[PDB]
């Protein structure tokens, strides 16, 4: 998604911040991504699903952000307020806030939003090959009960 | 000369449902009000015409000229509100 945005040295300024990650006190990084079009198909379907989440998102949900900001208050919540304050590139406010028993349509829309989220997760999610049960004290050999 | 008011569209407590129900109540009341007012005025006009026919006829009854008795018969023709235009 970012290397579509064709730049010079901004690709580097993104990559050197991005690639070195830390999980369980371990630094790993993956170099030399020539950014072929094979990732572009796997990214096009994420783009499709974000468009559909937008169009089929109900009236309860975008309201739920502002309503919980008015009801509760937290620093953690603020972080999400900071994202919604940092980007306001949609600004299309809805009209009605009555919710006058549209509840089957609401169920249908929320099922659709969850299913599009499942599609993006089915992109980003890789298949579990093994399930650990018993680990040696060396953390060198471990037993699993599952083979693809 | 009657005018249907309107339901203010931006504000409403519930939506399509309660504005339809309020419209149905207001329109049923307007319908029965206009029909009762019309029937009231038509019954008034017919009562006054049938009242004045008798006071006209009793005063025209006495004389015996042909123009007199022809005026008596023309003005003693019976009337309904559906016969009044002719």
List the helices and strands and how they pair.
This is part of a larger assembly, with chains A (148 residues) and B (86 residues).
Chain A: H1 10-18, E1 21-22, E2 27-28, H2 38-55, H3 59-71, H4 75-86, H5 103-124, E3 132-135, E4 142-144
Antiparallel strand pairs in A: 1-2, 3-4
Chain B: H1 16-60, H2 66-75
Helix pairs in contact in B: 1-2
Summarize, please:
Chain B: Belongs to the herpesviridae large structural phosphoprotein family. This is part of a larger assembly, with chains A (148 residues) and B (86 residues). Chain A is mainly alpha-helical.
Describe this structure in words.
This is part of a larger assembly, with chains A (148 residues) and B (86 residues). With 148 residues, chain A is mainly α. Chain A has helices spanning 10-18, 38-55, 59-71, 75-86, 103-124; strands at residues 21-22, 27-28, 132-135, 142-144. In chain A, the strands form two sheets. Chain A has a two-stranded antiparallel ribbon with strand order 1-2. In chain A, strand 1 and strand 2 (27-28) form a beta hairpin. In chain A, helix 2 (38-55) runs antiparallel to helix 5. The longest helix of chain A is centred in the last third of the chain and has 22 residues, at 103-124. Chain A is extended. Chain B has 86 residues and is mainly alpha-helical. Chain B has helices at residues 16-60, 66-75. In chain B, helix 1 (16-60) packs antiparallel against helix 2. Chain B is rod-shaped, with a radius of gyration of 24 Å. Chain A binds chain B through residues 95-96, 98, 100-101, and chain B through 10, 12-18.
Task: Bin the helical content of chain B.
Answer: 55-70%
Strand content of chain A: 5-15%
Q: Strand-and-helix sequence of chain A, N→C?
A: HEEHHHHEE
Helix/sheet category of chain B: mainly alpha
Largest sheet of chain A: 2 strands, antiparallel
Q: Main β-sheet of chain B: number of strands, strand sense, barrel status?
A: none
Number of helices of chain A: 5
Oligomer: part of a larger assembly
Termini distance of chain B?
26 Å
List the secondary-structure elements of chain B in sequence, H or E: HH
Apparent shape of chain A: extended
User: Over all CA atoms, what is the radius of gyration of chain A?
Assistant: 21 Å
Largest interface: pair, residues per side: A-B, 5 and 8 residues
Number of strands of chain A: 4
PDB class: virus
Keywords: murine cytomegalovirus, pUL32, pU14
Entry title: Atomic structure of the Human Herpesvirus 6B Capsid and Capsid-Associated Tegument Complexes
Chain A: Triplex capsid protein 2
């Amino acid at each position: 998604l970012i290397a579509v945005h064709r730049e010079y040295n901004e690709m580097q300024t993104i990559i050197d911040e991005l690639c070195s990650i830390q999980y369980r006190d371990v630094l790993i990084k993956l170099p030399d991504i020539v950014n072929d079009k094979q990732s572009m198909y796997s990214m096009k379907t994420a783009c499709i699903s974000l468009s559909m989440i937008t169009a089929m998102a109900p009236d309860i949900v975008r309201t739920y952000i502002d309503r919980l900001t008015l009801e509760d208050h937290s620093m953690l919540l603020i972080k999400c307020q900071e994202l919604l304050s940092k980007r306001t590139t949609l600004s299309t406010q809805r009209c009605g806030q009555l919710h006058a028993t549209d509840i089957k349509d609401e169920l249908k829309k929320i099922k659709s939003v969850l299913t599009m989220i499942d599609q993006i997760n089915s992109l980003t999610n890789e298949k579990t090959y093994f399930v650990v049960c018993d680990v040696s004290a060396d953390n060198r050999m471990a037993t699993c009960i599952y083979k693809n | 000369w009657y005018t249907v008011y309107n339901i203010n569209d931006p504000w409403d407590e519930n939506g399509y449902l309660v504005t339809s129900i309020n419209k149905l109540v207001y329109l049923g009341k307007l319908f029965v009000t206009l029909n009762q007012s019309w029937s009231k005025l038509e019954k008034v006009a017919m009562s006054q015409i049938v009242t004045t026919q008798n006071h006209l006829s009793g005063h025209l009854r006495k004389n015996e000229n042909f123009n007199a008795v022809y005026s008596q018969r023309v003005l003693q023709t019976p009337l309904t509100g559906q016969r009044v235009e002719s």
